[PDB]
Design an enzyme around this catalytic site. Structure first.
Site, PDB file in Angstrom:
ATOM      1  CG  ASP A  63      -0.282  -0.078   2.596  1.00 36.99           C
ATOM      2  OD1 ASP A  63       0.731  -0.829   2.705  1.00 36.99           O
ATOM      3  OD2 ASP A  63      -0.749   0.591   3.570  1.00 36.99           O
ATOM      4  CG  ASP A  64      -0.362   4.551   1.218  1.00 38.12           C
ATOM      5  OD1 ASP A  64      -1.353   4.488   0.435  1.00 38.12           O
ATOM      6  OD2 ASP A  64      -0.449   4.908   2.428  1.00 38.12           O
ATOM      7  CD1 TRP A 113     -13.845   1.438   8.104  1.00 35.49           C
ATOM      8  CD2 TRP A 113     -13.961   1.409  10.340  1.00 35.49           C
ATOM      9  NE1 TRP A 113     -14.760   2.416   8.493  1.00 35.49           N
ATOM     10  CE2 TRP A 113     -14.857   2.406   9.855  1.00 35.49           C
ATOM     11  CE3 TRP A 113     -13.876   1.207  11.703  1.00 35.49           C
ATOM     12  CZ2 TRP A 113     -15.622   3.196  10.703  1.00 35.49           C
ATOM     13  CZ3 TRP A 113     -14.631   1.985  12.539  1.00 35.49           C
ATOM     14  CH2 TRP A 113     -15.510   2.943  12.059  1.00 35.49           C
TER      15      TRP A 113
END
Ligand SMILES: [Ca+2]
Length: 641
Positions: free
Chosen positions: A230-231, A326
């Site tokens: 991610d990222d 989340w």
């Protein structure tokens, strides 16, 4: 009970915890459950997992679900019967909540979680949680039946690039070893994540280095692993290569060791808005990733709530139930806010469509327990999830000695303010109508209702009480340390609201002027806190009660000063935020930057100039030149620093 059980029958009778008791199954039951029971405490007490001799009579009452349990309390006996060892521990965590003042309600519970993996991902940008904070978290997770903690702080150099390749140094390795041991004692899967993608080479050297790092972590006791993509940008975003790495890890390590549990990946396309619906990334992962590997997902956006349609969209592409990451209460993009409000917005009917649900929390660990507790409740029993009751339950659990004060503070520290991720939460909903009316009336020269003025008055009064009591509270010192700057700011907000209301009542000119000067001083005091506290690189400072209360105060102040200026032909300044520098847009001060909210600026002193950015790609170094005035984003940087 939190989480609430799947099925509960209460008998409206109570009994006493047996002062004399016979314990059946103590030697064969989960030792972690038995330790809890022995701490808590003839009448028969039967403890064990399905298949144990102690619980043979109850074998048909025990839910046939992973982590399920049967719990029974009546006149003649207590039953604490797990479907598996973790179920037994969970029965005990419910048991502990039923026990009140040496008494037990007469009850029968059949319980199990609706979501298989439930927990926390320490996956944020910012200062990673302290070792002591992590120890405290792990205990908290066991109490609330969360079975997963994913360790992946973005700013841990041995988690991310380039030192993902390096073993942890000895001190940190020993700390990690202790965290894994504590996790296991609390029935929590410690999942160690790696974030190699930014600089990974798709060659043998780096593959081996990765497997070698995982081996080192295995030696520290780690039995669940994650690879996060991610990222990141560059060649590490290649889905075929990602899936090949994960499958190799699965086939050469996870399926080869005696006792590995979870293997999880976070995709580069980890939410709908960051996914290319016409690209092959997600379908490639879904088709190529071995079916036992979990794939994480944050929803329709980076920050979003999880909907039936949203999860349908991803599940169709990855060919398996998404493991939800989340992104609440994580505040790493609104660092000047505390997000202490309820957990809501997630569909309560979609348990079957997720493999897991973990919350990414704030860098403020204790503060995050409000949301964590509520996520645990939601994930275990989404069908019965009650937003506001659970939030109140969380607060009373976290700070029993000052629960109403912490509720006061949290209810006005829930929203994020405007932000690039477009995510907002309700705040101050109770007083929002009274505020909205009062201001509507007051502005237009209509008479406001006395009850609304009284409600505002009551609120500001309760805020000050709450602030003073929370500052001094010693039941959870680490929580109070975390929130203290915001508490100071919240108190000043309430004091300012009280004085602005005295201005509205406006007895005489002299009194009004006294209150006006008091308000200006409080504005300045808020500025000092905003400049001295929480001075991080991204969103420095301290904001509180931003959605409803601060706007009401500010607009009321500006209004009553306007009326004073008309009536007394005066020239009082009606500005609502203190600014020591001068420039219709307001200036801002962030760290050593003086900034026009997107011709001439005069600083309150001479400083060495560092540089101006402007942007209508304008930049100029000032080579430490003294500067007080600047004439012409629009950002002066000075040596302060
Ligand atoms: Ca057993």
């Amino acid at each position: 009970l939190q989480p609430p059980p799947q099925q509960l029958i209460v008998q409206n009778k109570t009994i006493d915890l047996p002062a004399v008791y016979q314990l059946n199954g103590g030697e064969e039951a989960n030792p972690h459950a038995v330790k809890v029971l022995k701490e808590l405490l003839g009448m028969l007490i039967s403890i064990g997992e399905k298949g144990d001799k102690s619980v043979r009579k109850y074998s048909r009452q025990i839910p046939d679900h992973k982590e399920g349990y049967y719990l029974s309390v009546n006149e003649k006996e207590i039953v604490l019967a797990g479907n598996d060892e973790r179920g037994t521990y969970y029965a005990l965590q419910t048991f502990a909540q039923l026990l009140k003042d040496g008494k037990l309600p007469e009850v029968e519970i059949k319980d199990y979680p609706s979501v298989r993996y439930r927990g926390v991902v320490e996956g944020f940008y910012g200062t990673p949680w302290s070792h002591q904070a992590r120890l405290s978290q792990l205990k908290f997770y066991g109490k609330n039946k969360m079975n997963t903690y994913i360790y992946g702080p973005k700013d841990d150099p041995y988690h991310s690039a380039p030192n993902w390749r390096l073993p942890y140094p000895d001190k940190e390795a020993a700390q990690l070893q202790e965290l894994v041991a504590v996790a296991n004692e609390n029935e929590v899967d410690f999942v160690w994540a790696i974030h190699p993608g930014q600089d990974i080479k798709w060659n043998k050297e780096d593959r081996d280095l990765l497997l070698a790092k995982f081996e080192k972590m295995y030696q520290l006791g780690v039995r669940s692993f994650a690879v996060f993509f991610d990222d990141i940008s560059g060649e590490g975003t290649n889905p075929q290569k990602q899936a090949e790495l994960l499958n190799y890890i699965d086939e050469k390590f996870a399926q080869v060791k005696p006792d590995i549990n979870q293997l999880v990946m976070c995709p580069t396309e980890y939410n709908k808005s960051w996914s290319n619906p016409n690209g092959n990334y997600l379908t490639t992962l879904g088709d190529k990733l071995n079916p036992s590997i979990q794939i994480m997902w944050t929803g329709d956006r980076v920050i979003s709530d999880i909907t039936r349609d949203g999860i349908s969209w991803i599940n169709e592409r990855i060919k398996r139930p998404a493991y939800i990451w989340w992104n609440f209460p994580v505040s790493d993009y609104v660092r000047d806010h505390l997000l202490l409000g309820p957990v809501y917005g997630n569909d309560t009917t979609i348990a079957k469509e997720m493999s897991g649900f973990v919350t990414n929390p704030m860098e403020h660990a204790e503060s995050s327990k409000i949301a964590i507790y509520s996520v645990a409740s939601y994930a275990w029993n989404p069908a019965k999830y009650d937003t506001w009751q659970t939030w109140k339950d969380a607060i009373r659990t976290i700070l029993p000695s000052a629960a109403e004060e912490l509720e006061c503070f949290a209810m006005h520290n829930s929203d994020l303010g405007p932000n690039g991720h477009g995510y907002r939460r309700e705040e101050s909903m109770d007083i929002q109508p009274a505020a909205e009316r009062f201001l509507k009336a007051f502005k237009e020269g209509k008479n406001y209702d006395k009850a609304d003025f009284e409600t505002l008055q009551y609120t500001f009064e309760r805020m000050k009480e709450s602030a003073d009591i929370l500052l001094m509270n010693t039941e959870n010192k680490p929580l109070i340390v975390e929130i203290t700057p915001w508490v100071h700011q919240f108190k000043l907000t309430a004091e300012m609201g009280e004085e602005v209301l005295k201005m509205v009542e406006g007895r005489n000119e002299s009194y009004f002027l006294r209150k006006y000067n008091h308000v200006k001083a409080l504005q300045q005091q808020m500025f000092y806190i905003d400049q001295t506290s929480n001075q991080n690189p991204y969103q420095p400072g301290v904001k509180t009660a931003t959605r409803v209360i601060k706007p009401l105060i500010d607009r009321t102040f500006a209004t009553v000063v306007k009326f004073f200026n008309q009536k007394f032909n005066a020239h009082l300044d009606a500005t609502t935020d203190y600014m020591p520098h001068k420039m219709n847009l307001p200036l801002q001060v962030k760290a050593n930057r003086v900034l026009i909210s997107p011709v001439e600026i005069e600083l309150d002193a001479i400083y060495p100039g560092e540089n101006i950015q402007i942007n209508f790609r304008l930049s100029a170094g000032l080579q430490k030149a003294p500067v007080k005035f600047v004439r012409f984003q629009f950002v002066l940087t000075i040596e302060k620093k």
